[PDB]
C-alpha cells in the first residue's frame, strides 16, 4: 500500500526513489534510530532494513561488519521489531522493507513472523536465501498479512524467471545491477529498484534513465557509519550529505 | 523445476539466493547425466580402485568382542587414500566439475580434512583449487594447512566474523556465485542445498555396497545393524544407502554428545536441535531460542557441524534409522580400546560410532548380534588431542 | 648345520654369540615349516587381505611424466595399514612367533615406524610386546612412542651408550638370549643374522608378486625397471624378489646420499661402504678405517641404517641389481613434486626411490621406459621435517 | 703354549686359575696399564683383555661403560696393541687372552689380525660374535699364528656342540656359568674356565671343586674401576684386595 502511494507520487513528480539500506541496531539501538531519522530527513523515499543474523551467506564485508557491531551491542530480532514499531510511529507514510534471512522468518513460524511485521507497520520483506522456487509459504504468508514479498531479479534472469518474479512480487522488484526493465513492465511486475554497487549520484540518475523506478544503496551508507564510529555527530552529518546528494540525482 | 526431488519429506530444499539457482540446476543436470553415463562410471571406478585403494577391507574384530555374543566388523575407510572416507566423493565431484567443463574448484574447511581431500583430488585431476578457511582454524590446523599447500591448493584465510568455518562457507558461496561458469563448489558433506545431499550420498554409496557384498561373503547374511558417526552425514549415508531397502538391517547414526547433552555443549542437532533453514537447507540445527545459529561442540573437530544432512532427518522421522549420541569420554574410551585390542588407531570421529557398538555389546553381552561399524577414518591426527587429555588427567 | 643357505655369495651368515644360535636354528626350522604349511599361508593371507588391506593399488602417474616417454607406476604400500610396507612382515613374524608357542615379542626401533608396526601386530595377535628404544630417539619421536603405548606395547628407554638404536639393538638381543623360549625377536629389516634376511624377504615378497600381476594386467608386459629405496633392504627386496628371474627387468636400489657422498654424511654403505661383520652378518657398512661402526645420515630417519641386507650386496656383486644414491635435496624435490602433481604425500624414504625415477625420466625424456617405483610409505609423518627445511630457506 | 705351561704348573700345585677381565684403556691408557700390573701383582694367573668396540652386542652395562670411558680417552685398537706389547715385555709368562668382536678382527684382514697378536705376544683370542659354525677362518688363522682360538660353551650345549668346542678350541674352554665339565674332559677339550657372574671367592672355589681349571671375573673388576674413578690410588688398592681374595680361593 505505502509503496503504491509512493511510486504514484514519485511518478507525478517525474522522479525516481532513493532507498538506503542499513542494519538495525548498528552500531547501537540509539545511534541506529538517529541514523534512520537522518536518512529520512535527508530525503530517503523508502527504507530497507536488515535484522542481524549469525549466518548470512549473502552479505559482503561492509554489511558483515554491521551485523558484528549490532551483535556486539546485544541487538536481537525482538529489539529490532521494537525499533521498527518506533520508526513507524514517527514516520507514517515512508515504505519500510526488511531484508531477512530465512531462519529468522521460519524460526517461530512463518505466519507469526509476517503477522509481527504487519503489527509494527512493515511494508515488505525480502528473504535473501529464499529463491522463487522455495517462496510459496513465504509469499503466501506475506500477502495474508498485507506484506509485500520482494524478489530479486538477477541480470541473467531467463524469461521464466522474469514471469515468476513479475507474478509473485509486490511493492517493488529488486533488480540487481534494462531490457529486463522493459520486459518486467511488459509482465506488469512491481516497479523496479536497482540495487548492488550503487554508491554515486550518477548511478542513481542512470538507473532512472534506464527505466527503473529508483535505486537502493547500502554498503555506501554503512561504510559512512563504520568510518565515523568514534564521531556520532560527524557520522550523521556525513550521512545527511550523502543521502541528499543521492536523492537529488533522482529528481 | 528440478530433475530430482530436492526434499526428503519436509527436509532439504534449495534455500540459496536466486543468483545461485542456475549453478545448482546446472550441477543437478550434470549429475543426472553422469549417473547414466557408462564412461563416467568407469572413470570414477578406475580412480576409486587404482588411486584411492577401493575396495576397502571389512575387518572382523575378535579381540574386542571376546566373552560376548556380538560379532563386530569394521568397514575400513581408514585405509582409503587420504585416511578418511571423504576421498570417495571429492573424486566424484572433481569428475563432475570436469564434465561441466570447469577447471577450478572452490571449497572451505574447518578441521581441514575436507580441504586436504579437495586438494588431493584437484592435484590429481589438474584442477585449480582454492580453499577458504577461517583464520582461527588456519591457526589450530597448521598440519592440514601445509598439506593443502603442498598439494598446490590456494588456502585463503578469511578473517571476517568469528572466522569460524561459517565465515568461509559463505566466502566460498560468494565466490561461486560469480565464478560458477568456470569453478565448481565442492561441498564437504551430505548437506547443503539440493543436489548436494543426493550427490554426496551417491558418491559415497560404495561404502554400503561393498559392506553388503563383503558381509554376505563372510557371514552369509546381512548385518543386524550398521553404525556410523554423524557430523554432516556423508559417511553414514554412504554406509546406510544400499541397506535402506533391507528392512531387517538397523541403521544407527551417532551424533557427538560432547560434554553431555544436558550441558548444552554437544553436536547433536538431529535429536536435540530444532528444525531451521540455513546453509541452503531445511534441517534440524543448533540454534538459539530466537533463531541464531548456535555453536556445536565435540572433542572431534570433524563432528563439529551445527546441523545435519536432510536425508538423515527424514530417515529418523519415519523410523527407518535411529540416532543416538556418544560423549567425548565414551569416544575416548573407544579410541583407546581399539588401539590396544585390534592395533588400529581410529579417528576420534569414527570412535563415536565404535563407542556405541561397544555399548550395544556391553549392555547386553548375551544378545546375539552381527554389527558393522563404519570406521570412517584413521586417528593418527588425533594422537596429540588424546595425549593432552590423558596427561591433563595424570 | 642349517636347513637353508645362510649366505648370498660372501654376504650374510650368523655372526652371533654361541648362546643365540639355538634361537636362530629354532626360528629357521619354524619358518621352513610354516612355508610348507597351507594353513599358515592361509592365515597370513587372511590377515594381509582383511586386516592390512592387500592387495595394494598400482597407480599410474600420468601428470608427473607429461611430455616424456616414461610411463610411471607407483606400488602403493603407503595404503597398507600402518602407512608403510613394514606391516607385511611383522604380521608374518608374529604368526611365526605363535607357531613356536611364544606369547611375547621383543623389538627395537629408531625412527619408530618398526616399533609401531611391531606394536600393532602384537596387539592384533595377542602378543606381549616390549620395544627397546634409545633415550635420544624416544625424545625425537614422541608421536611414534605414544602410538606404541596406545597399542599396549611396553616401550623401554635404554640410556646406555650414545643411546642410538645400536644400544637398543643389543639390549633387545641380550633380552632375547635369555627369553627366546617364550619371546620372539622381531627384526625390522632384511638384514641381521640368518634366517632373518630370508624370512623378511619372503614375508615382503607379495609386493613384487602383486606388482607383476598388476603391471601385466595393465600394460601386458613386465617393467623395464622396478625402483626402491634401501635403508635395511626389506621393501626393496620385497619388490625385487619375484622379478629376480626375469632378467629383462632392471632392479634399482636407492640408498640415501644425505648431504652428498663426498661429504661423508650419507647412508650409502652398499656402494660407498666397506664389507665388515656386525649385527650378526657380513655385509657392507659405514665404518672407520680401523673398524669402528660409523654413523649414517639422511634427511629420512628411516634410511638411517649403517649397513644393508646381505642379499642386496650379493645382487649388486653379480650385476643383477644396480644401486645408486639420492641426496636430501633430490628426495625433497621428489616429495614436493608428487604432492603437487599426483595428490600423494610420499614418505621421505620412498621419495628417494621416486627421485631416481624422476632422474631417469628427466635425463633422457625421449627414452621409452616403463618404470615402477615402490612407494614404501606415506609421508604425513614427514610434513614437519619438510616444513622446517623450507621455512629455514625462506 | 703359555696356557699349557700355566695349567701344568697350577695342577702340580693342586690349584685353580683366577683370570680377571678388563677393557684395555679404561679409564685411560696410563691408568689401565697400572690396573693390569696390579692385577698381576695381586695374583692373576692369566688375563682376558677387551679392545673397545663401537657396536658390542654382547657386553652388559658395566662393560659397556668401560668401552665408553676408553673411547672418551681416545683409545683405538692400534693403541691397544701398543699396550699389549708393553704388557708382554713386562710379564713374559702370564697368558694373555683377548676378547674381540668380529669386525675388529676382520677389518684389515683376519690373517693380519692374528699375525699382529702373535707379534705382540698375545696367547688367545675369543671372538664374541663368531659361533663355532662361522669360526673356520678365525680358528685357522689363529692356529697359523700360534694363537689359541677360544670358544664359549653354553650350559645347555648339546653333545654335538661339546664335541665341536672340544675339537676346535685351544688354551682353555670358556664355560658359561659340571657334567659338561666331565664331558669336556672326555672329549679332550682344553681346560675349562668358568665365567659370567663370578664375583665372590666362594664362586671360585666352587668352580674348582666342580672340576674346572679356574674362573674368570670381569664385571666385578670393572665395577671397582668405575666406583673409584676420582681416586686412582684407592682404585688400585681395592683391585689388589679383590684379586688377592679371589686368587686365594683357588688355592
Ligand atoms: O539490499 C541489499 N543490498 C543493498 C545495497 O547493495 P550494496 O549497495 O552493494 O550494499 C541486499 C539484498 C539482498 C542480499 O542478498 C543477496 F545478495 F543474496 F541477494 C544482500 C544485500
Ligand atoms: O669374558 C668376558 N666376561 C668375563 C666375566 O663375565 P662377568 O664377570 O659377568 O662380567 C665375556 C666373554 C664373552 C662375551 O660375549 C658373550 F656374552 F656374547 F659371550 C662377553 C663377556
Ligand atoms: C569428515 C569426517 C567425518 C564427518 O563427516 P560426515 O560427513 O558426517 O561423514 C567423520 N569421520 C571422518 C574420519 C571424517 O574425516
Ligand atoms: C622402514 C621404511 C623404509 C626403510 O626400510 P627398508 O627395510 O630398507 O625397506 C623405507 N620406507 C618406509 C616408508 C619405511 O617405513
Ligand atoms: Na552435526
Ligand atoms: Na643402509
Coordinates of C-alpha atoms in Angstrom, one line a residue, chain C:
Chain C
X1 CA 74.3 -77.0 10.1
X2 CA 71.2 -75.2 8.7
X3 CA 68.2 -76.1 6.5
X4 CA 68.8 -73.1 4.2
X5 CA 71.9 -71.3 2.9
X6 CA 72.8 -68.5 5.4
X7 CA 74.8 -66.8 2.7
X8 CA 74.2 -64.8 -0.5
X9 CA 77.7 -65.3 -2.0
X10 CA 80.1 -64.0 0.5
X11 CA 77.5 -62.0 2.3
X12 CA 75.3 -62.9 5.3
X13 CA 75.9 -65.6 7.9
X14 CA 75.1 -66.0 11.5
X15 CA 77.6 -63.9 13.4
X16 CA 76.0 -64.0 16.9
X17 CA 77.3 -65.3 20.3
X18 CA 77.0 -69.0 20.6
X19 CA 74.2 -68.6 23.1
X20 CA 71.9 -67.2 20.4
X21 CA 72.4 -70.0 17.8
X22 CA 69.7 -72.2 19.3
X23 CA 67.2 -69.3 18.8
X24 CA 68.2 -68.8 15.2
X25 CA 68.1 -72.5 14.5
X26 CA 64.6 -72.8 16.1
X27 CA 63.4 -69.9 14.0
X28 CA 64.8 -71.2 10.7
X29 CA 63.1 -74.6 11.3
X30 CA 59.8 -72.9 12.2
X31 CA 60.0 -70.8 9.1
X32 CA 60.7 -73.6 6.7
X33 CA 57.8 -75.5 8.3
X34 CA 55.5 -72.5 8.0
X35 CA 56.4 -72.0 4.4
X36 CA 55.1 -75.5 3.5
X37 CA 52.1 -75.3 5.7
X38 CA 48.9 -74.4 3.7
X39 CA 47.2 -73.4 7.0
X40 CA 49.9 -70.9 7.9
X41 CA 49.8 -69.4 4.4
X42 CA 46.0 -69.1 4.6
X43 CA 46.1 -67.4 7.9
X44 CA 48.8 -65.0 6.8
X45 CA 46.9 -64.3 3.6
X46 CA 43.8 -63.6 5.6
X47 CA 45.5 -61.1 7.8
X48 CA 47.1 -59.4 4.8
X49 CA 43.8 -59.1 3.0
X50 CA 41.3 -58.4 5.7
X51 CA 43.3 -56.5 8.3
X52 CA 46.2 -54.9 6.4
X53 CA 44.4 -54.1 3.1
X54 CA 46.2 -56.2 0.5
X55 CA 46.4 -56.1 -2.4
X56 CA 47.6 -52.5 -2.6
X57 CA 47.0 -50.5 -5.7
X58 CA 49.4 -49.9 -8.6
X59 CA 48.8 -46.3 -9.5
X60 CA 49.7 -44.9 -12.9
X61 CA 51.1 -41.4 -12.6
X62 CA 50.3 -39.5 -15.8
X63 CA 50.8 -35.9 -14.6
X64 CA 54.4 -36.4 -13.5
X65 CA 55.5 -37.9 -16.8
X66 CA 53.8 -35.5 -19.1
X67 CA 56.0 -34.5 -22.1
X68 CA 58.2 -37.6 -21.8
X69 CA 58.2 -41.2 -22.9
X70 CA 58.3 -42.5 -19.4
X71 CA 55.3 -44.4 -18.1
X72 CA 55.4 -44.4 -14.3
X73 CA 53.5 -46.6 -11.8
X74 CA 53.6 -46.5 -8.0
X75 CA 53.2 -49.6 -6.0
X76 CA 51.0 -48.2 -3.2
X77 CA 52.4 -49.6 0.1
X78 CA 51.5 -46.2 1.5
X79 CA 48.0 -47.5 1.5
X80 CA 48.8 -50.5 3.7
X81 CA 47.5 -50.5 7.3
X82 CA 50.1 -48.6 9.3
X83 CA 51.1 -46.4 6.3
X84 CA 54.2 -48.4 5.3
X85 CA 55.3 -51.8 3.9
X86 CA 56.7 -52.8 7.3
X87 CA 53.3 -54.2 8.3
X88 CA 53.5 -57.1 5.9
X89 CA 56.4 -58.8 7.5
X90 CA 55.7 -58.0 11.1
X91 CA 52.3 -59.9 10.7
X92 CA 54.2 -62.8 9.2
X93 CA 56.8 -62.8 12.0
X94 CA 54.1 -62.5 14.7
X95 CA 52.4 -65.6 13.2
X96 CA 55.8 -67.4 13.3
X97 CA 56.2 -66.5 17.0
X98 CA 52.8 -68.0 17.7
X99 CA 53.7 -71.1 15.7
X100 CA 56.7 -71.5 18.0
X101 CA 54.4 -71.3 21.0
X102 CA 55.6 -67.9 22.0
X103 CA 53.4 -65.1 23.5
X104 CA 56.0 -62.3 23.7
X105 CA 57.6 -60.1 21.1
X106 CA 60.9 -58.2 21.5
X107 CA 61.8 -55.4 19.1
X108 CA 63.8 -52.2 18.9
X109 CA 63.3 -49.1 16.8
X110 CA 64.9 -45.8 15.7
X111 CA 62.5 -43.8 13.5
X112 CA 59.8 -45.5 15.4
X113 CA 58.0 -47.0 12.4
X114 CA 59.1 -50.6 13.1
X115 CA 58.2 -50.1 16.8
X116 CA 54.7 -49.0 15.8
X117 CA 54.4 -51.9 13.3
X118 CA 55.5 -54.4 15.9
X119 CA 53.1 -53.0 18.4
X120 CA 50.0 -53.1 16.1
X121 CA 50.8 -56.7 15.0
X122 CA 51.3 -57.8 18.7
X123 CA 48.0 -56.1 19.7
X124 CA 46.1 -57.9 17.0
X125 CA 47.5 -61.3 17.7
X126 CA 47.5 -61.1 21.5
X127 CA 51.3 -60.9 22.0
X128 CA 53.0 -59.1 24.8
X129 CA 55.3 -56.6 23.0
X130 CA 58.3 -54.9 24.5
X131 CA 60.2 -52.4 22.5
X132 CA 63.7 -51.1 23.3
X133 CA 64.4 -47.6 22.0
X134 CA 67.3 -45.2 22.5
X135 CA 66.7 -42.4 25.0
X136 CA 67.6 -39.8 22.4
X137 CA 65.2 -41.4 19.9
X138 CA 62.4 -41.6 22.4
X139 CA 62.8 -37.9 22.6
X140 CA 62.8 -37.1 18.9
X141 CA 59.9 -39.5 18.1
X142 CA 57.4 -38.6 20.8
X143 CA 54.5 -39.3 18.3
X144 CA 55.5 -42.8 17.5
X145 CA 56.3 -43.6 21.1
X146 CA 52.7 -42.6 22.1
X147 CA 51.3 -44.8 19.3
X148 CA 53.3 -47.8 20.6
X149 CA 52.0 -47.3 24.1
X150 CA 48.4 -46.7 22.9
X151 CA 48.6 -50.1 21.3
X152 CA 49.7 -51.8 24.6
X153 CA 53.4 -52.2 23.8
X154 CA 55.9 -51.6 26.6
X155 CA 58.4 -49.0 25.4
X156 CA 61.7 -49.4 27.3
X157 CA 64.1 -46.4 27.1
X158 CA 67.7 -47.5 27.1
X159 CA 70.2 -44.8 28.1
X160 CA 73.4 -47.0 27.7
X161 CA 76.0 -45.6 25.2
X162 CA 75.1 -42.9 22.7
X163 CA 71.5 -44.2 23.2
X164 CA 71.1 -44.6 19.5
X165 CA 69.3 -47.7 18.2
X166 CA 72.5 -49.7 18.3
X167 CA 72.2 -49.6 22.1
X168 CA 68.7 -51.0 21.9
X169 CA 69.6 -53.4 19.1
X170 CA 71.9 -55.0 21.6
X171 CA 69.6 -54.5 24.5
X172 CA 67.0 -56.5 22.6
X173 CA 69.4 -59.3 21.8
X174 CA 70.6 -59.6 25.4
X175 CA 67.0 -60.0 26.4
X176 CA 66.3 -62.5 23.7
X177 CA 69.3 -64.6 24.6
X178 CA 67.7 -65.4 27.9
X179 CA 64.0 -65.4 27.0
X180 CA 63.9 -66.9 23.5
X181 CA 61.9 -69.9 24.8
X182 CA 58.9 -67.6 25.3
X183 CA 59.8 -64.5 23.3
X184 CA 60.5 -63.8 19.6
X185 CA 62.8 -61.1 18.4
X186 CA 61.0 -59.3 15.6
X187 CA 63.9 -57.9 13.5
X188 CA 62.9 -54.9 11.4
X189 CA 64.6 -55.3 8.0
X190 CA 66.1 -57.8 5.6
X191 CA 69.4 -57.8 7.5
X192 CA 70.9 -59.3 10.6
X193 CA 71.8 -63.0 11.1
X194 CA 70.3 -65.8 9.0
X195 CA 67.4 -66.6 8.9
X196 CA 66.2 -63.0 9.1
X197 CA 67.2 -61.7 5.7
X198 CA 65.5 -64.7 4.1
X199 CA 62.4 -64.5 6.3
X200 CA 61.9 -60.8 5.8
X201 CA 62.2 -61.1 2.0
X202 CA 59.7 -63.9 1.9
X203 CA 57.2 -62.0 4.1
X204 CA 57.6 -59.0 1.8
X205 CA 57.5 -60.9 -1.5
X206 CA 53.9 -60.1 -2.1
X207 CA 54.9 -56.6 -3.0
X208 CA 56.7 -57.8 -6.2
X209 CA 54.2 -60.6 -6.9
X210 CA 51.3 -58.2 -6.9
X211 CA 53.2 -55.7 -8.9
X212 CA 54.0 -58.3 -11.6
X213 CA 50.3 -59.4 -11.8
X214 CA 49.1 -55.8 -11.9
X215 CA 51.6 -54.5 -14.5
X216 CA 50.8 -57.5 -16.7
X217 CA 47.1 -56.7 -16.5
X218 CA 47.6 -53.0 -17.1
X219 CA 50.4 -53.0 -19.7
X220 CA 50.6 -56.5 -21.0
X221 CA 54.3 -56.8 -20.2
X222 CA 56.9 -56.5 -17.4
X223 CA 58.5 -53.2 -16.2
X224 CA 61.8 -52.1 -17.7
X225 CA 62.8 -51.5 -14.1
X226 CA 61.5 -51.5 -10.6
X227 CA 63.0 -48.9 -8.2
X228 CA 63.0 -49.0 -4.4
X229 CA 64.8 -47.1 -1.6
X230 CA 67.2 -49.1 0.5
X231 CA 67.7 -48.5 4.2
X232 CA 68.0 -52.0 5.5
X233 CA 66.6 -53.5 2.4
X234 CA 63.2 -55.0 3.1
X235 CA 60.9 -53.0 0.9
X236 CA 63.4 -53.2 -2.0
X237 CA 63.9 -57.0 -1.7
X238 CA 60.2 -57.4 -1.3
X239 CA 59.7 -55.6 -4.7
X240 CA 62.7 -57.3 -6.3
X241 CA 62.2 -60.9 -5.3
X242 CA 59.6 -62.1 -7.8
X243 CA 61.5 -60.3 -10.6
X244 CA 64.9 -61.7 -10.0
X245 CA 64.5 -64.5 -12.6
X246 CA 63.0 -62.0 -15.1
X247 CA 66.4 -60.9 -16.5
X248 CA 64.9 -58.2 -18.7
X249 CA 63.6 -56.4 -15.6
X250 CA 66.0 -53.9 -14.1
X251 CA 66.3 -53.9 -10.3
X252 CA 67.4 -50.5 -8.9
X253 CA 68.0 -49.9 -5.3
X254 CA 68.4 -46.3 -4.0
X255 CA 70.5 -45.6 -0.9
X256 CA 70.4 -42.2 0.8
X257 CA 73.1 -39.8 -0.3
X258 CA 72.4 -37.4 2.6
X259 CA 74.3 -34.1 2.0
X260 CA 76.3 -35.8 -0.7
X261 CA 78.6 -38.8 -0.9
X262 CA 81.7 -36.6 -1.0
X263 CA 80.7 -35.0 2.3
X264 CA 80.8 -38.3 4.1
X265 CA 77.4 -37.5 5.6
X266 CA 75.3 -40.2 3.8
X267 CA 73.8 -43.6 4.3
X268 CA 75.1 -45.5 1.3
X269 CA 77.2 -48.4 2.6
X270 CA 76.5 -50.7 -0.3
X271 CA 78.2 -48.6 -2.8
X272 CA 80.4 -46.4 -0.6
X273 CA 81.0 -48.5 2.5
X274 CA 83.4 -51.4 3.3
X275 CA 82.5 -55.0 4.0
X276 CA 82.6 -55.8 7.7
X277 CA 80.9 -58.0 10.2
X278 CA 78.3 -56.6 12.5
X279 CA 74.7 -57.1 13.6
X280 CA 75.1 -60.8 13.0
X281 CA 76.1 -60.5 9.4
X282 CA 78.9 -60.0 6.9
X283 CA 77.9 -57.0 4.8
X284 CA 79.0 -53.6 3.6
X285 CA 78.8 -51.0 6.3
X286 CA 79.7 -47.4 7.3
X287 CA 82.9 -47.8 9.3
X288 CA 86.1 -46.0 10.3
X289 CA 89.5 -47.0 8.9
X290 CA 90.2 -49.1 12.0
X291 CA 86.8 -50.9 12.0
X292 CA 84.5 -48.9 14.3
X293 CA 80.9 -48.7 13.0
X294 CA 80.4 -45.2 11.5
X295 CA 77.2 -43.2 11.8
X296 CA 74.9 -42.9 8.8
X297 CA 73.0 -39.8 7.8
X298 CA 69.9 -39.0 5.8
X299 CA 67.1 -36.4 6.0
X300 CA 64.9 -39.5 6.3
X301 CA 65.3 -41.2 9.7
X302 CA 64.0 -44.4 8.1
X303 CA 67.0 -44.8 5.8
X304 CA 69.5 -44.1 8.6
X305 CA 70.7 -47.7 8.9
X306 CA 74.5 -48.0 8.8
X307 CA 74.6 -51.3 6.8
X308 CA 72.5 -53.1 4.3
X309 CA 70.9 -56.5 3.8
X310 CA 73.3 -59.2 2.5
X311 CA 71.1 -60.2 -0.4
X312 CA 71.4 -56.7 -1.9
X313 CA 75.2 -56.8 -1.6
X314 CA 75.1 -60.1 -3.4
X315 CA 72.7 -59.0 -6.2
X316 CA 75.0 -56.0 -6.7
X317 CA 78.2 -58.1 -6.8
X318 CA 76.9 -60.3 -9.6
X319 CA 75.4 -57.4 -11.5
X320 CA 71.7 -58.4 -11.3
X321 CA 70.7 -55.3 -9.4
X322 CA 72.1 -51.8 -9.6
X323 CA 72.4 -49.4 -6.7
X324 CA 72.5 -45.6 -6.7
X325 CA 72.1 -42.8 -4.3
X326 CA 69.8 -39.8 -4.0
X327 CA 70.6 -36.7 -1.8
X328 CA 68.4 -35.0 0.7
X329 CA 67.7 -32.2 -1.8
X330 CA 66.7 -34.6 -4.6
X331 CA 64.4 -36.5 -2.2
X332 CA 62.8 -33.3 -1.0
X333 CA 62.1 -32.2 -4.6
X334 CA 60.6 -35.6 -5.4
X335 CA 58.4 -35.3 -2.3
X336 CA 57.1 -31.9 -3.3
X337 CA 56.6 -33.0 -6.9
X338 CA 54.5 -36.0 -6.1
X339 CA 52.3 -33.9 -3.7
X340 CA 51.6 -31.3 -6.3
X341 CA 51.2 -33.5 -9.4
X342 CA 49.5 -36.6 -8.1
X343 CA 48.0 -35.6 -4.8
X344 CA 50.0 -38.2 -2.9
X345 CA 52.3 -37.3 0.0
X346 CA 55.1 -39.9 0.0
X347 CA 57.3 -40.9 2.8
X348 CA 60.7 -39.2 2.6
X349 CA 62.2 -42.7 2.4
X350 CA 60.1 -43.5 -0.7
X351 CA 60.9 -40.1 -2.1
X352 CA 64.4 -41.3 -2.6
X353 CA 63.2 -44.0 -5.0
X354 CA 60.8 -41.6 -6.8
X355 CA 63.6 -39.1 -7.1
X356 CA 65.8 -41.6 -9.0
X357 CA 62.8 -42.5 -11.3
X358 CA 62.4 -38.7 -12.0
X359 CA 66.1 -38.5 -12.8
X360 CA 65.8 -41.5 -15.2
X361 CA 62.9 -39.7 -16.9
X362 CA 64.3 -36.2 -17.0
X363 CA 67.8 -37.1 -18.1
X364 CA 66.5 -38.9 -21.2
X365 CA 63.0 -37.6 -21.8
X366 CA 62.7 -39.4 -25.2
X367 CA 63.7 -42.8 -23.9
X368 CA 60.7 -45.1 -23.9
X369 CA 60.6 -46.8 -20.5
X370 CA 58.0 -48.4 -18.2
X371 CA 59.0 -47.9 -14.6
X372 CA 57.6 -48.9 -11.2
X373 CA 58.6 -47.1 -8.0
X374 CA 57.8 -48.9 -4.8
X375 CA 56.0 -46.2 -2.7
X376 CA 57.1 -47.8 0.6
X377 CA 55.1 -45.5 2.7
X378 CA 53.1 -42.3 3.2
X379 CA 54.7 -39.0 4.3
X380 CA 52.2 -37.4 6.6
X381 CA 54.9 -38.1 9.3
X382 CA 57.4 -36.0 7.3
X383 CA 55.3 -32.9 6.9
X384 CA 57.1 -31.1 9.8
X385 CA 60.5 -32.1 8.6
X386 CA 59.8 -30.7 5.1
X387 CA 58.2 -27.7 6.5
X388 CA 61.1 -26.7 8.8
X389 CA 63.6 -27.1 6.0
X390 CA 61.5 -25.0 3.5
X391 CA 61.0 -22.2 6.0
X392 CA 64.7 -22.2 7.0
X393 CA 65.3 -21.4 3.3
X394 CA 62.6 -18.7 3.2

